[PDB]
Symmetry: D2
Subunit: 120 residues, 4 copies
Amino acid sequence: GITGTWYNQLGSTFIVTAGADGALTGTYESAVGNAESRYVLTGRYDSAPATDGSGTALGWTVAWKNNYRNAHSATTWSGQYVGGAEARINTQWLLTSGTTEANAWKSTLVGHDTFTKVKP
Amino acid sequence: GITGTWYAQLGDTFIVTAGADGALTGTYEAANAESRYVLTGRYDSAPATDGSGTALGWTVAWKNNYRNAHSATTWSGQYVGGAEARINTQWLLTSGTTEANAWKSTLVGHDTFTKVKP
Amino acid sequence: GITGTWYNQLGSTFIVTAGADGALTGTYESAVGNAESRYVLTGRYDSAPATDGSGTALGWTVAWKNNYRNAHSATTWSGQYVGGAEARINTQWLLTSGTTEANAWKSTLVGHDTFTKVKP
Amino acid sequence: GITGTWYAQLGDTFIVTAGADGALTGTYEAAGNAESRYVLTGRYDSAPATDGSGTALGWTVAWKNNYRNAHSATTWSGQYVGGAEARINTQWLLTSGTTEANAWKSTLVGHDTFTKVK
Ligand SMILES: O=C(CCCC[C@@H]1SC[C@@H]2NC(=O)N[C@@H]21)NNc1c(-c2ccc(S(=O)(=O)N3CCOCC3)cc2)cccc1-c1ccc(S(=O)(=O)N2CCOCC2)cc1
Ligand SMILES: O=C(CCCC[C@@H]1SC[C@@H]2NC(=O)N[C@@H]21)NNc1c(-c2ccc(S(=O)(=O)N3CCOCC3)cc2)cccc1-c1ccc(S(=O)(=O)N2CCOCC2)cc1
């Protein structure tokens, strides 16, 4: 039930396909949705989750380069998918920017996004 | 110079292919086939040319043909080239949990990789 | 506006006093609030925040030892206070357990708590 | 063994008193001029496990003193390991006061190891 279009609290969108082999592929974009704001995503998920009501673990990465813009950074999301009527993906993320060695200490931001299949 | 074999302080190994397009693809070895896992990620395939590192990230879901930990790790970091190339990362390891345990679902840490085995 | 009794989304309670010198002192407890579940906190906050509508930075620590229990761990919350008739403290936290060197890699949990002055 | 002067890899220094009760109190210096010194306060486990495990601890610095105000605070969470080469291994979170619109980028994360050796 991971496959589909998800929306987070910031208005960002990501469309993902979950493969039988554990692959996650798709696109991550802004609320705008313009070509300039769409980025490739790739990740993995647990294709054989526990049958005890636990969430499904997964992660993905977006490097913030496309054919229009380059922010010289990449975000990874790590979290879990919870299925059902109100399916959700709860994540924490790390956004690392390319930096000089001198600035490396301030290279990585941390936050949390929750995605639903519904747009507020 | 990202493509190749990388070793962490713990002795984890991963071998990765960096596609011209920004793709990272390879395997992560937790130390044997039993301990080999698929990894995929992304990197900046056009980094700044000012001495800045190259941003990247990847994910491993800890399931293979032998074991399933019902968890996934993502590493976020940057590649620094040179005579002593390195990948400096921080990571998030999320386990699949019940809702009641979701507060303790995620570990955080850091890994530095080099192309030299210790 | 930081001084007072706050509740997060787990039901945990923390009572804090914010001193003029930037000190945070008080107690962190469970929803029940019995003696066995109360722990000392101490932290710091920006006693002269920006006057541009920005939050107030702060942080605090609880070591999970009191005179009843000892978890051999400590949590730090890093976040900001946002004033309002609906004031809130948005935080991320790190919970580190004492470990052997072998297990140090899995010593630290990360998460996020939001506190309000109303029970959930 | 926590009480003393500690040095990070970046050359930050901090001087801390560990109270019998679990209190950490002291100062954190960036550069060691007055302009660069800040108050720290935290907590540590004053009755650690006696099984080779580290001692859990954490502390906070709000980056305001009589000279500068960065409108931010860092918390370090980690553990003390004693010995001939005592160390404090930490991860940290640095949160800046921000507008709501920028709150998503309010927090940096990283890691610091401290030793009592300059
Ligand atoms: O790194 C970024 C933003 C990308 C990270 C979004 C994060 S990932 C986790 C969190 N969850 C989300 O969904 N969004 C956020 N900086 N912005 C630049 C971009 C860029 C702009 C828009 C988009 S988007 O597709 O419309 N979308 C926005 C909403 O979030 C999802 C993505 C994507 C990328 C491209 C090039 C450059 C930048 C950039 C970065 C920093 C600065 S700056 O403010 O630091 N600047 C002024 C100060 O001096 C230095 C330069 C300026 C431009
Ligand atoms: O240590 C904890 C959790 C304390 C941190 C709460 C976190 S701080 C961030 C987050 N925000 C919150 O408001 N609460 C959570 N509880 N358990 C205690 C233990 C203990 C810990 C682990 C295990 S175990 O994992 O099961 N283990 C044995 C079995 O094999 C696997 C390993 C066992 C025991 C030891 C001593 C004390 C505690 C404890 C319990 C409750 C509280 S509380 O009632 O004061 N309260 C819990 C929930 O709200 C926060 C405080 C505080 C400490």
